[PDB]
Design a protein around this ligand. Structure first.
Ligand code: ATP
Ligand code: ATP
Ligand code: MG
Lengths: 578, 317, 41, 127, 470, 40, 193
C-alpha cells in the first residue's frame, strides 16, 4: 500500500508527499492518531487529503497511509438492531470503549468481529457462483440472513466450511481460484449495487395512514417527499411510517438532526413493538444517527450509507424502507463541503451538481429482480425543510422533479392543530393510477370509485369555501350546506390522525375502506332526504354523526362489527326520519 | 490502426486530468482513460498546449492514480455510427443499445457536433404537420422545418403531450394534393434526465401504439453520467439530419426536459471555472442551445425535414 | 401582493448575481496570489 | 397489430448478429493461429517498423522472447534497445525517449481499431 | 524552550517563520520583539518551508531582524478547577479581577469532543428563570439550547443579567420533592463595550450572583482570536463542572453576532473564500460545535444549558446567523421593539416565541398540572386580542361584541401585568397565579383549551392580586 | 388471433434460417477480406 | 474619413405609422429597438428594409436565426423597390452570421456591415444599417474576454463594451463626403435584453 508523510497542514487540508500511486477519493489515515480522510487531488508525488476530524496537534513528517479503497460500508450479519454514524461506526461500541465523548481517531469495526453465527451452507463443492447468489444462511433475529457472493465475483467452489458457529471473519467458502468468501463484504457507498432488472411498481407501500394509503399512495419501490415548514409534522410522520409501515426492514437516516431530536429516536425506538412479529422494532431497523456537530463528511455520506445498506437488504430478497430525515440538512452539508473546495455556487449558494446527487440517491429506489433471482424493493421517503417554507428552494425543486409522490404539510393546518398537516390540494401521487389493480383484487372493485367520490366531495367543499368565507355556513342552501357538512365529517374523521394516540396511530386498508363507505352512504342518504324535502338542520342531530366521529378510535379487531352496526344505524336513523 | 498510450499524468483534480507529453492530441479529441483496475473511462481534450493537455473525464475520477492511469486516443472528433436500421431501437445517450438486440452495423460515422447549414442552402418551411391537437393545429400550426418548444411547468403533463404527439404526428399528404403518394415519417425521441418511471412510461406508449417501428429513442437517465446528457441531443439530431438529408425522411425530433440539459451544462461549465451568467448558467449557453436547435430545417432540393419540439419546464413558472 | 413578490424575487436575484461575481473575483485573486508565491515565495 | 412483423424483424436482427459474432470468432481464432505459420516474423517486423515510425524519438522496443531474435537486427538498424517481456503476441510495442509514452501494435489491437469499418464491409458482402 | 528567528514576512495579522517544522498546527506561540515585549500567536499553517502565525493584538513594532518565536503549548488548554466559581477571566483564561491565578486540577482541551448520541438522555426537568413569559409560556428545560433573539437597540444585556441573577432549580416540586442540588452560571461576553462590562460586573457583584458564576469577558478592543476562543473556554468550564462535579450549569453567550463577525474576519485573514452573504461556508459547523456542547448525559446528574443571545443585524430573521441558530437550537425567545418603546420590560413577545422541549419539562411532577393548558390558552387569547385591537382602530369599540371587548382588555392587561414584570423575581407559582387572574377576566367556557378540572380548581381569583400592586 | 402470431413466428424462424444459409456461402470470403485488411 | 458632419433634418421614413409620426428618426440618425423575444424586432427591421426610403440597405444578421436570412433571400427578389421599381434585393447587402456559426464572426460582421454602409455613403447614397442583434456582439466580446482572462465589469461583459458600441453607433450621420457630395448612414440596432 501507498505510505507517505505530511508536507503541509492548513485547516482540514493536508498535503502528503511520497503518495505516488494513491488513488483518487481513497480513504487515508493521516497522522499518528490515525485521523481519517479522503484524497481529493493528486499532483505529481503529492496527494491532498481532507481530514474528517480536527487536525490540531499534527506536525510535519507524520505518516500517512492509504487504505486503498473509497468510502465503503461493511455489509454482512450484524447490521440489524445497530446504531451507526454516517460512515458506519457503531456508536454503542464506541461508547463502550471511550465513555461519553468520541475521542478522535478511534477505530471500531462495523460488524462485531467477536460474535458467532449459526452457519447453514447452501452451496456444495464444485458449484459455480455468480454475483448475488446465496452461499449460505445465517439467523438474525426473525430473519434468515443470506450470505451473498459479492457482485463482482466469479468462479467455482473449492471448499465450504461445514455447519457450525463461526465469526464473520471465517472464510466460509473458498473458490478454485483460491479467493476467500467470508460472511461480509465491502461495497463503495457511491456505486449503486447491480441488479438484474428493474420493474414497474404494482403493490402499495401501506404506511398505516388513511390520507397516504387512500388518496396519495406510494408504491413498493417508489419515492416520496414530505416537505413542510418548521413544526409542520414531518418527523412525526417519518417515525409513524418507521413504526407501522409494511416494510420487512427499515433503515432510518438522521443526517443533521439536533442532539435532543436524535435522543428522542434513540430512546423511543427500543421500547416500541413490531406489528408483524410482536418483538422489538429495533430488530428490523438500522439507525444512522448523525448530529449537527459530527464531521461534515459523515453527514454528507449518511444518505449514501443508508441507500447502500437498503440495497443490500433488497438483494437478500427483503423489501426495505429508507427514511431520510431533513435532506435539507444533507444539502447544507454538501454546500459546506463544496465551499471548502472553493467551487462556484449555483442558485442559493448550492453547488451546481446538487440535483445530480439527489438523483443518484432517489433513483436507487425501485423494485428489482435481484442478481440472485428474487424480488426485492427499496422505497425512499425523504423529508425536506424549505428555509422560508417556500417550495422555491433548490432542494425542494430538485426533489419534485424526481419524486413520484409529494406530501405537502401546510403550516396553516398545523397552526389549527390539524394533524397530519397534509394539504390535499398541493399533495399529489403519480402512483395512484398504477395501484388500482391491487385494491380491486384485494378488497373490491368499488374502492377506487369510492376514493374518487371522496376526492370529488373534497373538491366541491373547496369551491364553496369562498362562499362560506363571505357568509357563515348557515346561509347556504341545503345542498351546499350538506356538502359542507360531509366535508367537515370527511376531514375530521377520515383525513385526521394522531400519531401519539394508542389506537388512532394505525389504520388498515379494509378499515379505511369501511369508513369511506360509511361516510359516502351517509352522504347519499342525506341527498335522498333533501330531495324528499326534509330540512338539513334535522340531520345535524342524528347520533350517526357521533358514530362516524368515533370510527377513528375503534380497535382493529372491533371494527368488523362496528361497521355493520354503523351501516344498520345509517339505514335506520334516516328511514325513521320524518 | 495502432494504439498510442500516454502515461505522463501529472494532475487529477475533480473532473480534470493533465497529460504532460500530449502534443499529438487534437483539441476536441475523444480519449479513453485506463486505470489499474482495468476499467476504461471516456474523456475529452478541452485544452492543449506544449506543456500539457487537459482532459475532462466524462465520469467521476474515483480510482485514478498517477502511477497506473494511462490515456489513449479514440478519435480526433466525436462521431456516431448512423444507419437506416436504427429505426425501432433504443439507445442510452452515448450510442449503446439498451434494448437487448445486437449493435447496429454502421453505414457512416458523422460528427456529432454537426456543421452549420448555409443560409443560402435553406428553404422556407411551407408544409403543415398534423399534431392531432386542435390548438396547435389551428392556432399554433407546426410546419415542417420548424422548432416549436412547449413551455411546461412544475407539475403540468408535458410528457403526456410529448407522447401524444409522437403517436399522432402525421404529414397528411392528401390535403397537399400534389399527386405524389404517402411519404416517410419518423420520430427521434431524446430524453435527458428522465426518471425510470418516465422511461417506462415512454417505452410503454411507443411500444403500445406501434410508433416504435417508426421511431429512434435516445434515453438518458438522471442517474447517468452528466456529460452523457450533453451528448444526447447531438446524437439524436445527427440521426435526424442523416435520415432527412440522405434518405428523404421527415423526422420529428422531440427533446424532452431541456431544463435537464441546461443543468448539466451548468455543472460542466462550473467544472472548469468559467465565468458564470444570469443565474450561474454559462455565458455561452445561448450559443450551445443554438447549436442544438438550429439543426432543424428544410434544405433546397431535398425532400426531407427535421422538426424539433424542445419540451422544457419553466422554473417556478 | 404578487407585484411585491415579483419585486422581492428580482432583488434577490440581482443581489445573488453580485455575490457570484464577487466570488469569481476572489477566486481569481487567490489564484494570482498562489502564482506570485510560486514564482517568488 | 404488427407485432408479428416486429417479431420477424427482431429475429432477422438476431440472426445477423449471430452471423457477425461468428465472423468475429473466426477472425480472432485465425489471428491467434497465425504464429503457427512461418510468415509471422515478417508481419511483426513490419509492425515494429511502423511503430517506430509513429515515434520519431523512440527509445525502446518490447516483445516476447521468441520475437527478439528477429527484432534485434531492426533495433540495431533503428538504434533502440529491446528487452523480453510477458507482453501481447502478434505485435510489438515501443517507448518514447521521455519514457512517458508508449505505442502498441498487437494484431488484436488492429482488429479492434478496424472492426468499425470491417463490420460494414462484411455485412455488405454477406448480403 | 526552543526559539525561532527565521522571520521572513510580517503583514497584517500574519507572520511567516522559517525552519519551524516542529511547530504543531494550532499551537500557541509567543512573539518576543526587540524590546522584550511578548505577543501571542497561533500557528494556522505548518509546512516544510515555513509556518504561518496569526499574531493577536497587533504588529506595531515587529521586525525581521530581532523578532523571535517560541512554543507555549501544542494545543490550547485551559486550567479548570472548582475554584473558578467567583472569578473573572479575559477570554483566554487570564484573570482580570486582580486576584491570584487559579491552581488547575487539570488542563483540558478547549475544542471539546463531541458527545456520543447514544450517551445522552432526554431532557425532563425545568429551570425557573423568574420571568413569566419564559417559565410559563416558553419554559426553559435543562439540557436545552434556547436563544434570545434581539434587535439593535433592545435590552438583551439586562435580560441576560436578570436570568443569571434569578435562575434556579426547584427540586421541591420534583415528584415528592427534594432539598437542594448544585447550580452555577458560566457567563461569556464576546465583543462587549466598556459600558456593558461595567454593567455586568456591578450586577453580578451587587446581588451575590458572582459567588455561583464564572465570567469570561472579551472586549471589543481585544483581539478577535480571543473572541473565537471565549465561548469554547466557557463551554469547557461548563462541561467540566457539569459532568465531573455534578453541577447544573447555565451558560450564557452574550453576543453570537459578534462571534460570527469575528469568525468571518478571521476566515478572511486566512484567505478563505466566503460562502453565502460573505460568512464562512463552515459557520453552521462552528455554531454546531458551540451550541451542541450542552445537553444531558445518561448516568450523570449534572446538566448544561445554553441561552445564546443574538442581535439580529437588521431585525432580519432570514439573516444567516439567526437561520443557522434556528436550525441548530430548540426554540427562540423574541424581543419586540414595540413592547420596548411602550415601556414594557422584559419585552418578550409571546407570539413569535417558542420552546420545543417545553412539553418535556412541564407537567404533573414538574411545575403544575395545568401548565400546558394555561400556556396554550394564554397564547390563543393574546392572539385574538391583538387582532381585535387592530380592528378597533377602524371599527371603534362600540360595534365590537362583549367578548371582543373582553379580549381587548385581556390583551392590555397581559401586556401590562404579565409581560411587564420589571425586575421582580417571580416563582413559577406566582407566574401561574397571575396567568389565572388574567384568564379569569374572560368568562369560563371561552377557555376551550383548559380542562374543566383546572378551571374549577383555579378560576375566579381576583385580578386585584396583581392589579392592586403590579 | 393466435394463428396469425404463430404464422409470423414460423415466418421469422424461416427468415433466420434463410439468413444463416445465405451467410454460410460467403463467410469465408468475408473472413479473408477482414484478414487482408487488418494485416499490414 | 469625411469632410464634415451635418445636422440631420430630413426624416428616415420607416413606413410604420407609430415610428414615423410619434418617434421619428432623421436620415443620419441612430435608433435602438430593444425587446424580449416575440416582441417584433426582426419583423420591424425587415419592414424597414422593405419600405424605407434609403437608397441602399445593409442587413446584418449578427447571431440570429438562419431562417431570418433565407426569408430575405427568398422573398426580397420578388418584391418591388419603392423608389426605383426594380427588384428589392438589388438595393440590399446581407451580412449573415447565424446563431451556430462562429462566435467572433459576429464582432467581425458588425464592422464589415458598417464599413460597407460607409462606403455606399461615400458614393453619395443614403444608407440604412439594420443591425439585427447587438446583444450577440456583446456576448461574443464577453466570451473572448473570458478567454483572455480579463476582469468583467457587469454581468461578465468587458468594461470596454460601451466604448465599442459608441464607436459603432457614431459611425452614422449625414456628412459631406470627401468628394463634395452628401450621404448618410442610419443605424437601427436591436437589443436582446
Ligand atoms: N400526526 C401528529 N399527531 C400528533 N401531533 C402531531 C402530529 N404531527 C405533528 N404533531 C405536533 O406537531 C409537532 C410537530 O413536530 P415535528 O417533529 O413533526 O416537526 P417537523 O415538521 O419535523 O419540524 P422541524 O423542521 O422542526 O423538524 C409535533 O411535535 C406534535 O406536537
Ligand atoms: N408588425 C407586426 N405585424 C404582425 N405580426 C408581427 C409584427 N411584429 C411581430 N409580429 C409577430 O411576432 C412574431 C415575432 O416577431 P419577430 O420576428 O420580429 O421577433 P423578434 O422580436 O425579433 O424576436 P426574437 O428575439 O425571437 O428574434 C412574428 O413572427 C409575427 O408573428
Ligand atoms: Mg427576431
Amino acid at each position: 500500500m501507498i505510505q507517505g508523510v505530511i508536507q503541509k497542514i492548513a485547516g482540514p487540508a493536508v498535503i502528503a508527499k511520497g503518495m505516488l500511486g494513491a488513488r483518487m477519493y481513497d480513504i487515508c489515515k493521516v497522522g499518528e492518531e490515525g485521523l481519517v480522510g479522503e484524497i481529493i487531488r493528486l499532483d505529481g508525488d503529492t496527494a491532498f487529503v481532507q481530514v474528517y476530524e480536527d487536525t490540531s496537534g499534527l506536525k510535519v513528517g507524520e505518516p500517512v497511509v492509504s487504505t486503498g479503497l473509497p468510502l465503503a460500508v461493511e455489509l454482512g450479519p450484524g447490521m440489524l438492531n445497530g446504531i451507526y454514524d454516517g460512515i458506519q461506526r457503531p456508536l454503542e461500541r464506541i461508547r463502550e470503549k471511550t465513555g461519553i465523548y468520541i475521542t478522535r481517531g478511534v477505530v471500531v469495526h462495523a460488524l462485531d468481529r467477536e460474535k458467532k453465527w449459526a452457519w447453514t451452507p447452501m452451496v456444495k463443492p464444485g458449484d459455480e457462483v455468480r454475483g448475488g447468489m446465496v452461499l449460505g444462511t445465517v439467523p438474525e433475529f426473525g430473519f434468515t440472513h443470506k450470505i451473498l457472493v459479492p457482485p463482482d465475483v466469479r468462479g467455482r467452489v473449492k471448499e465450504v466450511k461445514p455447519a457450525g458457529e463461526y465469526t464473520v471473519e471465517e472464510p466460509v467458502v473458498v473458490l478454485e481460484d483460491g479467493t476467500e468468501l467470508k460472511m461480509y463484504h465491502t461495497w463503495p457507498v457511491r456505486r449503486a449495487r447491480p441488479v438484474q432488472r428493474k420493474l414497474d411498481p404494482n403493490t402499495p407501500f401501506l404506511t398505516g395512514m388513511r390520507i397516504l394509503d387512500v388518496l396519495f399512495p406510494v408504491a413498493m419501490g417508489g419515492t416520496a417527499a414530505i416537505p413542510g415548514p418548521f413544526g409542520a409534522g414531518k418527523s412525526v410522520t417519518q417515525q409513524s411510517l418507521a413504526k407501522w409501515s409494511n416494510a420487512d426492514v427499515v433503515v432510518y437516516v438522521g443526517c443533521g438532526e439536533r442532539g435532543n431530536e436524535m435522543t428522542d429516536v434513540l430512546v423511543e425506538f427500543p421500547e416500541l413493538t413490531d406489528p408483524k412479529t410482536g418483538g422489538p422494532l429495533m430488530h428490523r431497523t438500522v439507525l444512522i444517527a448523525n448530529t449537527s456537530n459530527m464531521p461534515v463528511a459523515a453527514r454528507e455520506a449518511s444518505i449514501y450509507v443508508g441507500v447502500t445498506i437498503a440495497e443490500y437488504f433488497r438483494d437478500q430478497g427483503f423489501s426495505v424502507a429508507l427514511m431520510a430525515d431533513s435532506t435539507s440538512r444533507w444539502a447544507e452539508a454538501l454546500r459546506e463541503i463544496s465551499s471548502r473546495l472553493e467551487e462556484m455556487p449555483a442558485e442559493e449558494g448550492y453547488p451546481p451538481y446538487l440535483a445530480a446527487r439527489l438523483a443518484a440517491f432517489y433513483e436507487r429506489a425501485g423494485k428489482v429482480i435481484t442478481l440472485g433471482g428474487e424480488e426485492g424493493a427499496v422505497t425512499i421517503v425523504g423529508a425536506v425543510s424549505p428555509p422560508g417554507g417556500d417550495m422555491s428552494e433548490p432542494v425542494t425543486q430538485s426533489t419534485l422533479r424526481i419524486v413520484g409522490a409529494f406530501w405537502r404539510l401546510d403550516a396553516s393546518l398545523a397552526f389549527r392543530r390539524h394533524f397530519p398537516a397534509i394539504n390535499w390540494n398541493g399533495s399529489y401521487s403519480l402512483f395512484t393510477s398504477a395501484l388500482d389493480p391491487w385494491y380491486r383484487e384485494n378488497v373490491a372493485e368499488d374502492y377506487p370509485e369510492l376514493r374518487d367520490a371522496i376526492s370529488e366531495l373534497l373538491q366541491r367543499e373547496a369551491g364553496l369555501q369562498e362562499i362560506v368565507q363571505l357568509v357563515g355556513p348557515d346561509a347556504l342552501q341545503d345542498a351546499e350546506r350538506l356538502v359542507i357538512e360531509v366535508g367537515r365529517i370527511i376531514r375530521e374523521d377520515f383525513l385526521q390522525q394522531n400519531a401519539y394516540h394508542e389506537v388512532d396511530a394505525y389504520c388498515s386498508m379494509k378499515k379505511a375502506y369501511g369508513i369511506m363507505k360509511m361516510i359516502l352512504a351517509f352522504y347519499k342518504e342525506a341527498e335522498a332526504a333533501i330531495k324528499r324535502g326534509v330540512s338539513i338542520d334535522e340531520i345535524l342531530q342524528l347520533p350517526v354523526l357521533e358514530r362516524i366521529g368515533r370510527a377513528r378510535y375503534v380497535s382493529e379487531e372491533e371494527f368488523p362489527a362496528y361497521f355493520e352496526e354503523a351501516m344498520k344505524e345509517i339505514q335506520g336513523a334516516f328511514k325513521a326520519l320524518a | 490502426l495502432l494504439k498510442k498510450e500516454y502515461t505522463g499524468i501529472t494532475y487529477i483534480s475533480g473532473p480534470l486530468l493533465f497529460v504532460e507529453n500530449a502534443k499529438d492530441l487534437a483539441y476536441g479529441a475523444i480519449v479513453d482513460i485506463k486505470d489499474g483496475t482495468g476499467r476504461v473511462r471516456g474523456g475529452q481534450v478541452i485544452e492543449v498546449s506544449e506543456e500539457y493537455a487537459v482532459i475532462q473525464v466524462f465520469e467521476e475520477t474515483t480510482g485514478l492514480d498517477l502511477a497506473t492511469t494511462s490515456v489513449s486516443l479514440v478519435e480526433d472528433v466525436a462521431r456516431l455510427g448512423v444507419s437506416k436500421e436504427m429505426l425501432g431501437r433504443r439507445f442510452n445517450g452515448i450510442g449503446k443499445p439498451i434494448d437487448g438486440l445486437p449493435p447496429i452495423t454502421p453505414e457512416k460515422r458523422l460528427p456529432i457536433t454537426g456543421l452549420p447549414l448555409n443560409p443560402v442552402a435553406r428553404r422556407k418551411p411551407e408544409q403543415f404537420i398534423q399534431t392531432g391537437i386542435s390548438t396547435i393545429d389551428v392556432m399554433n400550426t407546426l410546419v415542417r422545418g420548424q422548432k416549436l418548444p412547449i413551455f411546461s411547468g412544475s407539475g403540468l403533463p408535458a410528457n403526456e403531450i410529448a407522447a401524444q404527439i409522437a403517436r399522432q404526428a402525421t404529414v397528411r399528404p392528401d390535403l397537399s394534393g400534389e399527386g405524389e403518394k404517402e411519404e416517410p415519417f419518423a420520430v427521434v425521441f431524446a430524453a435527458m434526465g428522465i426518471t425510470q418511471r418516465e422511461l417506462s412510461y415512454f417505452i410503454q406508449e411507443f411500444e403500445r401504439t406501434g410508433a416504435l417501428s417508426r421511431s429512434v429513442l435516445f434515453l438518458n437517465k438522471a442517474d447517468d453520467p452528466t456529460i452523457e446528457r450533453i451528448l444526447t441531443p447531438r446524437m439524436a439530431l445527427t440521426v435526424a439530419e442523416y435520415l432527412a438529408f440522405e434518405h428523404d425522411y421527415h423526422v420529428l425530433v422531440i427533446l424532452t426536459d431541456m431544463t435537464n440539459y441546461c443543468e448539466a451544462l451548468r455543472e460542466i461549465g462550473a467544472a472548469r471555472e468559467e465565468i458564470p451568467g444570469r443565474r450561474g448558467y454559462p455565458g455561452y449557453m445561448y450559443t450551445d442551445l443554438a447549436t442544438i436547435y438550429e439543426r432543424a430545417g428544410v434544405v433546397e432540393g431535398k425532400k426531407g425535414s427535421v422538426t424539433q419540439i424542445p419540451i422544457l419546464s419553466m422554473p417556478d413558472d | 401582493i404578487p407585484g411585491i413578490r415579483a419585486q422581492i424575487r428580482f432583488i434577490q436575484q440581482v443581489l445573488e448575481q453580485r455575490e457570484r461575481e464577487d466570488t469569481f473575483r476572489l477566486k481569481r485573486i487567490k489564484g494570482k496570489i498562489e502564482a506570485r508565491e510560486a514564482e517568488e515565495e | 397489430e404488427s407485432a408479428g412483423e416486429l417479431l420477424v424483424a427482431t429475429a432477422r436482427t438476431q440472426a445477423r448478429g449471430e452471423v457477425l459474432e461468428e465472423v468475429r470468432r473466426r477472425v480472432r481464432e485465425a489471428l491467434e493461429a497465425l504464429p503457427q505459420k512461418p510468415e509471422w516474423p515478417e508481419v511483426v517486423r513490419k509492425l515494429a517498423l511502423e511503430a517506430l515510425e509513429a515515434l520519431p524519438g523512440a527509445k525502446a522496443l518490447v516483445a516476447n522472447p521468441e520475437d527478439l531474435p528477429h527484432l534485434e537486427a531492426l533495433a540495431r538498424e533503428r538504434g533502440v534497445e529491446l528487452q523480453a517481456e510477458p507482453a501481447l503476441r502478434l505485435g510489438v510495442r515501443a517507448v518514447g525517449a521521455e519514457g512517458k509514452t508508449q505505442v502498441e501494435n498487437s494484431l488484436l489491437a488492429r482488429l479492434d481499431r478496424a472492426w468499425d469499418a470491417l463490420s460494414s464491409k462484411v455485412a455488405q458482402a454477406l448480403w | 524552550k526552543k526559539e525561532y528567528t527565521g522571520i521572513t514576512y510580517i503583514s497584517g495579522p500574519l507572520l511567516f517563520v522559517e525552519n519551524a517544522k516542529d511547530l504543531a498546527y494550532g499551537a500557541i506561540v509567543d512573539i518576543k520583539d526587540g524590546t522584550g515585549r511578548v505577543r501571542g500567536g497561533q500557528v494556522i499553517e505548518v509546512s516544510e518551508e515555513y509556518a504561518v502565525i496569526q499574531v493577536f493584538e497587533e504588529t506595531t513594532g515587529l521586525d525581521l531582524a530581532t523578532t523571535s518565536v517560541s512554543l507555549v503549548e501544542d494545543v490550547a488548554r485551559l486550567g479548570v478547577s472548582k475554584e473558578m466559581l467567583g472569578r473573572r477571566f479575559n477570554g483566554i483564561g487570564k484573570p482580570i479581577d486582580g486576584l491570584p491565578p487559579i491552581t488547575p486540577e487539570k488542563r483540558l482541551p478547549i475544542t471539546g469532543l463531541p458527545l456520543n448520541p447514544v450517551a445522552r438522555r432526554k431532557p425532563e426537568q425545568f429551570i425557573q428563570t423568574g420571568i413569566s413569559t419564559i417559565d410559563v409560556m416558553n419554559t426553559l428545560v435543562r439540557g436545552q439550547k434556547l436563544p434570545i433573539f434581539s434587535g439593535s437597540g433592545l435590552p438583551a444585556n439586562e435580560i441576560a443579567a436578570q436570568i443569571a441573577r434569578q435562575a434556579t432549580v426547584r427540586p421541591d416540586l420534583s415528584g415528592e420533592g427534594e432539598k437542594e442540588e448544585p447550580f452555577a452560571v458560566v457567563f461569556a461576553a464576546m465583543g462587549i463595550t466598556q459600558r456593558e462590562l461595567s454593567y455586568f460586573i456591578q450586577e453580578f457583584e451587587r446581588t451575590g450572583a458572582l459567588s455561583r458564576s464564572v465570567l469570561f469577558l472579551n472586549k471589543a478592543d481585544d483581539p478577535t482570536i480571543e473572541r473565537i476562543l471565549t465561548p469554547r473556554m466557557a463551554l469547557t468550564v461548563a462541561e467540566y463542572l457539569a459532568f465531573e462535579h455534578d453541577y447544573h450549569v447555565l451558560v450564557i453567550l452574550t453576543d453570537m453576532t459578534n462571534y460570527c463577525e469575528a469568525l468571518r474576519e478571521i476566515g478572511a485573514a486566512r484567505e478563505e473564500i466566503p460562502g453565502r452573504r460573505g460568512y464562512p461556508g463552515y459557520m453552521y459547523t462552528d455554531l454546531a460545535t458551540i451550541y451542541e456542547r450542552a445537553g444531558v448525559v445518561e448516568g450523570k446528574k449534572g446538566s448544561v444549558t445554553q441561552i445564546p443571545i443574538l442581535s439580529m443585524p437588521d431585525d432580519d430573521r432570514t439573516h444567516p446567523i439567526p437561520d443557522l441558530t434556528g436550525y441548530i437550537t430548540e426554540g427562540q425567545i423574541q424581543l419586540s421593539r414595540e413592547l420596548h418603546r411602550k415601556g414594557i420590560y422584559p419585552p418578550i413577545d409571546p407570539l413569535p416565541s417558542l420552546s420545543r422541549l417545553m412539553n418535556n419539562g412541564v407537567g404533573k411532577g414538574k411545575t403544575r398540572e395545568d401548565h400546558k393548558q394555561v400556556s396554550d390558552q394564554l397564547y390563543s387569547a393574546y392572539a385574538n386580542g391583538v387582532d381585535i385591537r387592530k380592528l378597533v382602530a377602524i371599527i371603534g369599540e362600540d360595534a365590537l361584541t362583549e367578548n371582543d371587548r373582553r379580549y381587548l382588555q385581556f390583551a392590555d392587561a397581559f401586556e401590562r401585568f404579565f409581560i411587564n414584570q420589571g425586575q421582580q423575581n417571580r416563582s413559577i407559582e406566582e407566574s401561574l397565579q397571575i396567568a389565572w387572574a388574567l384568564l379569569s377576566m374572560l368568562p369560563q367556557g371561552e377557555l376551550k383549551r383548559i380542562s374543566k378540572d383546572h378551571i374549577g380548581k383555579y378560576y375566579g381569583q381576583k385580578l386585584e392580586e396583581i392589579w392592586g400592586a403590579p | 388471433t393466435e394463428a396469425l402470431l404463430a404464422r409470423y413466428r414460423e415466418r421469422a424462424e424461416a427468415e433466420a434460417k434463410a439468413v444463416r444459409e445465405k451467410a454460410m456461402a460467403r463467410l469465408d470470403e468475408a473472413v479473408a477480406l477482414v484478414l487482408k485488411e487488418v494485416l499490414p
